[PDB]
Amino acid sequence: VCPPLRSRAYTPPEDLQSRLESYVKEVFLPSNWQDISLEDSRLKFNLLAHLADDLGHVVPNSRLHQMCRVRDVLDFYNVPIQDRSKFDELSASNLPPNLKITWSY
Amino acid sequence: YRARPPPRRRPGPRWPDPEDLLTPRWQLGPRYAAKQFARYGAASGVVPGSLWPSPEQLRELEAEEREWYPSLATMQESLRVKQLAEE
Amino acid sequence: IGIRLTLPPPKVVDRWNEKRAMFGVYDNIGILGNFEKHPKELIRGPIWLRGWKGNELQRCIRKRKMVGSRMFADDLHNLNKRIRYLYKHFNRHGKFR
Amino acid sequence: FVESVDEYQFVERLLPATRIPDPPKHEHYPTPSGWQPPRDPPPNLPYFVRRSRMHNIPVYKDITHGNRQMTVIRKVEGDIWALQKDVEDFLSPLLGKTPVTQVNEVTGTLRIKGYFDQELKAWLLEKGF
Amino acid sequence: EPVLRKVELPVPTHRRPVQAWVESLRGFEQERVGLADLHPDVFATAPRLDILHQVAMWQKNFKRISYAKTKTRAEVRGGGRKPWPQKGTGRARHGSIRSPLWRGGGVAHGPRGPTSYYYMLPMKVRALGLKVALTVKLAQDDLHIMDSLELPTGDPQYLTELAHYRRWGDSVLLVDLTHEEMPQSIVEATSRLKTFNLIPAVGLNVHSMLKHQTLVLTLPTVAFLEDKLLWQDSRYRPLYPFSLPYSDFP
Amino acid sequence: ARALDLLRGLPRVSLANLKPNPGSKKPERRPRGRRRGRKCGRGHKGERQRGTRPRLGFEGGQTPFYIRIPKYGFNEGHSFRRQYKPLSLNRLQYLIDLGRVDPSQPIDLTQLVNGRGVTIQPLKRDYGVQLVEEGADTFTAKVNIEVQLASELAIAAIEKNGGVVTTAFYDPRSLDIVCKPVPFFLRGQPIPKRMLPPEELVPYYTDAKNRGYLADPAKFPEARLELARKYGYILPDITKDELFKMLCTRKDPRQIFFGLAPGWVVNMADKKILKPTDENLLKYYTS
Numbered sequence A: 001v002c003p004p005l006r007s008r009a010y011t012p013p014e015d016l017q018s019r020l021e022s023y024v025k026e027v028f029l030p031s032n033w034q035d036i037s038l039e040d041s042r043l044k045f046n047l048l049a050h051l052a053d054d055l056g057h058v059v060p061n062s063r064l065h066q067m068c069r070v071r072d073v074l075d076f077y078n079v080p081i082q083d084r085s086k087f088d089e090l091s092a093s094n095l096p097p098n099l100k101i102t103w104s105y
Numbered sequence B: 001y002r003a004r005p006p007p008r009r010r011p012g013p014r015w016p017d018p019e020d021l022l023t024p025r026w027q028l029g030p031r032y033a034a035k036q037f038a039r040y041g042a043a044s045g046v047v048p049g050s051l052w053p054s055p056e057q058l059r060e061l062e063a064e065e066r067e068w069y070p071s072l073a074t075m076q077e078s079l080r081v082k083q084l085a086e087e
Numbered sequence C: 001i002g003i004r005l006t007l008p009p010p011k012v013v014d015r016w017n018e019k020r021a022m023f024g025v026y027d028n029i030g031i032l033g034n035f036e037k038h039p040k041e042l043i044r045g046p047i048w049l050r051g052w053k054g055n056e057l058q059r060c061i062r063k064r065k066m067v068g069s070r071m072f073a074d075d076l077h078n079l080n081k082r083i084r085y086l087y088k089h090f091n092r093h094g095k096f097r
Numbered sequence D: 001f002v003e004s005v006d007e008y009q010f011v012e013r014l015l016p017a018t019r020i021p022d023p024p025k026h027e028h029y030p031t032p033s034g035w036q037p038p039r040d041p042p043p044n045l046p047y048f049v050r051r052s053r054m055h056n057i058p059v060y061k062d063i064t065h066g067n068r069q070m071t072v073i074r075k076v077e078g079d080i081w082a083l084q085k086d087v088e089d090f091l092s093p094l095l096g097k098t099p100v101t102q103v104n105e106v107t108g109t110l111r112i113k114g115y116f117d118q119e120l121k122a123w124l125l126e127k128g129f
Numbered sequence E: 001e002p003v004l005r006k007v008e009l010p011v012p013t014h015r016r017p018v019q020a021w022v023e024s025l026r027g028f029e030q031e032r033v034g035l036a037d038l039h040p041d042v043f044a045t046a047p048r049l050d051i052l053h054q055v056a057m058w059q060k061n062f063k064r065i066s067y068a069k070t071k072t073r074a075e076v077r078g079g080g081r082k083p084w085p086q087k088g089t090g091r092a093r094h095g096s097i098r099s100p101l102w103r104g105g106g107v108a109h110g111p112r113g114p115t116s117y118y119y120m121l122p123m124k125v126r127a128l129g130l131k132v133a134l135t136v137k138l139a140q141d142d143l144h145i146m147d148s149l150e151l152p153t154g155d156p157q158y159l160t161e162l163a164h165y166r167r168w169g170d171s172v173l174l175v176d177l178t179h180e181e182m183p184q185s186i187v188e189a190t191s192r193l194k195t196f197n198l199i200p201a202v203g204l205n206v207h208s209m210l211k212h213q214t215l216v217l218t219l220p221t222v223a224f225l226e227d228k229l230l231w232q233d234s235r236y237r238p239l240y241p242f243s244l245p246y247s248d249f250p
Numbered sequence F: 001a002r003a004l005d006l007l008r009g010l011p012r013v014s015l016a017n018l019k020p021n022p023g024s025k026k027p028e029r030r031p032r033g034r035r036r037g038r039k040c041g042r043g044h045k046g047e048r049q050r051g052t053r054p055r056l057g058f059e060g061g062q063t064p065f066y067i068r069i070p071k072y073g074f075n076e077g078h079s080f081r082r083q084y085k086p087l088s089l090n091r092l093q094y095l096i097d098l099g100r101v102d103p104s105q106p107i108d109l110t111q112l113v114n115g116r117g118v119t120i121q122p123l124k125r126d127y128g129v130q131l132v133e134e135g136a137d138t139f140t141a142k143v144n145i146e147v148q149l150a151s152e153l154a155i156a157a158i159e160k161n162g163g164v165v166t167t168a169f170y171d172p173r174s175l176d177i178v179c180k181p182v183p184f185f186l187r188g189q190p191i192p193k194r195m196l197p198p199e200e201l202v203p204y205y206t207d208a209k210n211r212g213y214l215a216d217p218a219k220f221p222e223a224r225l226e227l228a229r230k231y232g233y234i235l236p237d238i239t240k241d242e243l244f245k246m247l248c249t250r251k252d253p254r255q256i257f258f259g260l261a262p263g264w265v266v267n268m269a270d271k272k273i274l275k276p277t278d279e280n281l282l283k284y285y286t287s
């Protein structure tokens, strides 16, 4: 049975740093954990898979190589993303009373 | 869909039937057999002894060599007499 | 009046039929297959222009050389005349000389 | 009549190689021909000039129209504009004025008007590429 | 147990291998079963869309053989006699009823015989085009690495639903190492589909990669492509066609 | 890279987005419209517009330039002149430094071609490789090289650096075989016996001063001493060199490849060498 399609929208959690450092302790601990180099494939996979499973948002293959440090992972997971349609975006962009937008799609 | 199987070279030697009229003549001579032996080893099924010239062919080659490629001694003698004449 | 008064019947093209879907496959047969087969060997067509290109005169010369003996009588006569005319045109006419 | 033997070493010797061999390690550089391996670790610069498959600096003379002389630094990776700035700084004292150049960002190449192949090769060797 | 792949071929010291998620088709949610390191010179090269265009047009054209032909005034039937004398008739001068001017006459400059458009780009250029296509897919997030193409079932519905769930494109090009060993499940699944096309590794091409929105590769196919495309770099200039024996070329 | 990030941002690359590199596709000019129509750039009447102007080289009836000049034998026998590709000592040192030519083994035309240091075209009357004095001052490799021609200075440099140089003749067939052995082995023919130099070239290859492969070995030490005295270096005693055997190895005058003998058949498919045993064949191939 195919699971229902997942929404691509993702709002970063408020306790993002705490969750990330907990996962870092689980995977790898030392001071300045933000600079822990993700050069080991095993540890990189463990951390990224745990984060993806927890947050419902995974690092795309394009950015996977540039996620070189825990700081980079934190930046990627704190930048938000939205999946609303263009119609929804235009309608929610505070249209003035004299502007009407409709789709025949 | 699924792609058709990738094109591949016909494995092993290819031996056209001599009886067929459409087979090119260059595929029937000993040169073709030698090339097939070189390419496919013993799998060619051609007797290696055929590769070397038959005695008549060897006689023809020896005659041609005697006719056109003089020995080192003959070349040196011709050069010596030419130099003597020039001097 | 050389314009039709009705829309032509709609032309539906199946962009995902087998031919279009698998088009281009094995074009890299050489580089991706130890160069056992040259990509030109994937060309199906007239025997005299498989993996070969040239102008009209060269094409006619190649056709006569390769399949001339198997051509029909009038077709071969036409090919000979075309080769003659193309020779004359290419070797005796043109802006540049 | 026939006699098969295994002396195929003398044929393996004749067999040519398809892959360019890695240059052998020399105790002293530069080599008698002048070649020098790229510096390891790579220099920490905004750009990188990858060596050719022959392990030579990708700096080439070019000529067009019989009078336009140019030099091309071809295999450039990174900040081609930083490379252009460095080349201009290096060549202006030699030429007397800032050299005219084209930065082909798409191809990752730098073209400079005038022949400077030897000077640019030496300069890149000093930089360590 | 993560499936971790490292780059077998040497990587340039100034470049770090790009990375990708190794997935599996055995389950809908199996979107991360490992991590693969992909050679930078194959999957992180310059985006040369000009080379992409060159290779795509080559692929479209070199096979082309246009079978369009027209009869010239010499080949049109008849037209030997002069229609009428030069002078005295009061009509235009003509030498045959089959000249291009006449109705039913020959074609002055029409298509002539089966014409070939065959031309070969350098094999280095074609390999670089393949590399650029792979880099474009990876950068645009259309490339998906798999451990294997084995499916739980041969039902095309399962494959379509899995692609929709994973948000793949309307068109998927799945690639396997060799034709003979392709799993029966995926063979059955893709034989009945039109936008999901299964090809062997040797069949990868820029035109099909561009036509299909997403490109699915297996780890053996990744290694195969890396080796084949990197060899073109650091190969000598040929002494003779590579089909012939070489000291180190399979 | 920034380009890859821009790709990530940009729409998908498909067959509806491809465009040739600007400047690669010149527009096609065809004779339609005001500017390119009417006379279509062909001029006005005369032969040029009719497309019937006289052949190239025709001067309107005046005796052409290319015919009023007397015939001179500039190119007589050009297709019969022997050609030798130059191999400067600079090029040889470059190859040795890059490892494309291994100096620990005897260097010959096959090794040079395999290392891609030289390109021989027997069909274009190339008769082999000639050593060239260029780069002699900076040449330092000790090598046993066999070539077809060699300059006095090149020989001097090779011998000063402790190496050995011999000039070996190759008739066009043997030259082609040695340059491209693998195609010859695929031809399936038995290895032929190398032919002797033509009468004109016999003295060159029988002269010790050229290190000819047919010259008397007893005369080599005197020639080496003469070159050493002329060029002011001490003749190194190679007999004491650890690689003396390799330096001394020279193929037989009738032998194309070092180990393989004429008449042998190289079966590359199963890695074998068939050697004929018939007495007549052996006599012919030893002749």
Ligand SMILES: [Mg+2]
Binding pocket: D062, D063, D064
């Ligand atoms: Mg040029």
Ligand SMILES: [Mg+2]
Binding pocket: E074, E078, E079, E080
């Ligand atoms: Mg007629």
Ligand SMILES: [Mg+2]
Binding pocket: E095
């Ligand atoms: Mg008429």
Ligand SMILES: [Mg+2]
Binding pocket: E076, E104, E105
């Ligand atoms: Mg008609």
Ligand SMILES: [Mg+2]
Binding pocket: F034, F035
């Ligand atoms: Mg005008």
Ligand SMILES: [Mg+2]
Binding pocket: F045
């Ligand atoms: Mg007029």
Ligand SMILES: [Mg+2]
Binding pocket: F044, F045, F046
């Ligand atoms: Mg006039």
Ligand SMILES: [Mg+2]
Binding pocket: F061
């Ligand atoms: Mg007159």
